[PDB]
């Protein structure tokens, strides 16, 4: 949407928030290995803690964020903990991993699980509540995140060889301007039969439409996320010196996310006219094609296209899911099911799926494992067309 004060407030919020995340999440493994000297096999204990506490905070954030509608109480804590970004990585999390590895991963498990693994979707669900009130499209807001994500990647790559810590300090600063935005943003004020309630939220589990939507999450969405976990190593497996392979990967991510933003700009216009479930199916198809495609790749060119292929599914997955959520279910639960049906249950299945696929990486191998993931992702996207209540592809 065009010039509307409340839109620029939260559009810049996504830009500066995912500018925080772009500094750690993409290229996270390179933080623990090349700089902090954790073994390439030890990192599982850290991801486990981050996964454990995100399991915990996601259902919290979902139920909470819905209880207090657009009150802003939740995002102020997050925006508060984000100010800790710099001192956490530099002086706390880092040296606590040179010390006992276990404890150092707990404080990272709780911190990052809170601010990012669970905090990010809570910010997405909140700004989607602002989406329908102040009259604009959610996709036009979240494309800002793809640009900050990219720009931050551009800055960490430039600064990796000189003063990598510089990017963390930016995070804390961004969090402060993230607070300025949150102050001048206008929504319901504090001091707080059609409202939210736990009883009606647990009765929500009994709804079949939830079960099917969940099936899509763990069947075709979770599988896609574990596929991307170790894609960067598989990406470097087509290049000679790794620091070349990672350099290319850093180009495709930065540029690709710009391509991802552009697509997200128009995504609302498409997702509006072809339905909600169709965006999930289309995303699920782009997903399945990326897995099965990576199973047969044979040239760096072929694998680069497959990475950029990620940039085409994100807009139809994010803009699409909310557009399927807030139509098949009551809006008053929009933030709760998105946090529990998507993030929590996705996070749940990713526990078993991640260790199961990791055994194939050792047993059969990358592309070979990608073939299995591709079949189940493709497979569950098939039954998804019939299960998901809604129009569907036939409606043309």
């Amino acid at each position, epitope marked *: 949407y065009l010039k509307n004060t409340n839109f620029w407030m939260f559009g810049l919020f996504f830009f500066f928030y995912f500018f925080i995340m772009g500094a750690y999440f993409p290229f996270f493994p390179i933080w623990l290995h090349d700089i902090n000297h954790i073994s390439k096999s030890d990192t599982w204990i850290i991801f486990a803690a981050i996964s454990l506490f995100s399991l915990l905070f996601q259902p919290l954030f979902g139920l909470l964020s819905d209880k207090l509608g657009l009150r802003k109480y939740l995002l102020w804590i997050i925006t508060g903990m984000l100010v800790m970004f710099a001192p956490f990585f530099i002086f706390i999390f880092g040296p606590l991993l040179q010390y006992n590895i276990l404890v150092g991963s707990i404080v990272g498990g709780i911190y990052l699980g809170f601010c990012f693994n669970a905090g990010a979707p809570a910010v997405e669900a909140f700004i989607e509540k602002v989406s329908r009130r102040s009259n604009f499209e959610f996709g036009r807001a979240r494309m800002f995140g793809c640009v900050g994500w990219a720009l931050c990647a551009s800055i960490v790559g430039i600064m990796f060889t000189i003063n990598n810590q510089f990017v963390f300090w930016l995070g804390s600063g961004c969090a402060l301007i993230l607070a300025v935005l949150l102050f001048f943003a206008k929504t319901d004020a504090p001091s707080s039969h059609s409202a939210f309630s736990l009883k009606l939220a647990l009765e929500l589990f009994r709804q079949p439409k939830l079960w099917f939507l969940s099936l899509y999450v763990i069947g075709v969405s979770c599988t896609y996320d574990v596929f991307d976990q170790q894609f960067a190593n598989f990406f470097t497996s087509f290049f000679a010196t790794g620091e070349q392979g990672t350099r290319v990967f850093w180009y495709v991510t930065t540029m690709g996310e710009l391509l991802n933003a552009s697509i997200m700009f128009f995504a609302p216009l498409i997702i509006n006219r072809i339905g909600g479930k169709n965006a999930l199916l289309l995303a699920g198809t782009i997903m399945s094609v990326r897995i099965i495609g990576s199973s047969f790749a044979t040239s760096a060119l072929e694998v680069v296209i497959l990475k950029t292929l990620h940039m085409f599914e994100v807009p139809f997955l994010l803009v699409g899911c909310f557009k399927y959520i807030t139509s098949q279910f009551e809006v008053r639960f929009s933030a709760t099911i998105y946090l529990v049906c998507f993030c929590f249950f996705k996070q749940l299945a990713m526990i078993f799926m991640s260790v199961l696929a990791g055994n194939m990486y050792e047993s059969i191998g990358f592309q*070979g494992a990608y073939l299995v993931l591709g079949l189940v992702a493709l497979g569950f996207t098939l039954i998804s067309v019939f299960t998901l209540s809604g129009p569907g592809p036939l409606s043309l």
Partner: nanobody
Amino acid sequence: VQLVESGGGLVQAGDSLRLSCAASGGTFSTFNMGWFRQDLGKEREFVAAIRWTGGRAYYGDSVKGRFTISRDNAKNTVYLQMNSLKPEDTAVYYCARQGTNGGGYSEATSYNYWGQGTQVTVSS
């Protein structure tokens, strides 16, 4: 899964010395293998590497245009053809198998399984 390495020995400058590497354990669907070598003092140097599903093969600079590498699925065996050997080819040639961690095919560190070594000597 281990790595046996056939071939090796003494050859006159100009001969052709075909190396072979088989293994026992698992089918390397996906997995791609390669060869390295080490002389008197040089750190492990790259020579060749090949993956399945495509003749995709990679070769080093000092070796380009003379060594040919091929693979055989099911048989789970890969060979290294050497032609136009010169004395600087003296070394102990290792077999390998790539790892899921690490960065690229040209680096020794990126291969989890190493072979025992098979020395080839070349004199004028």
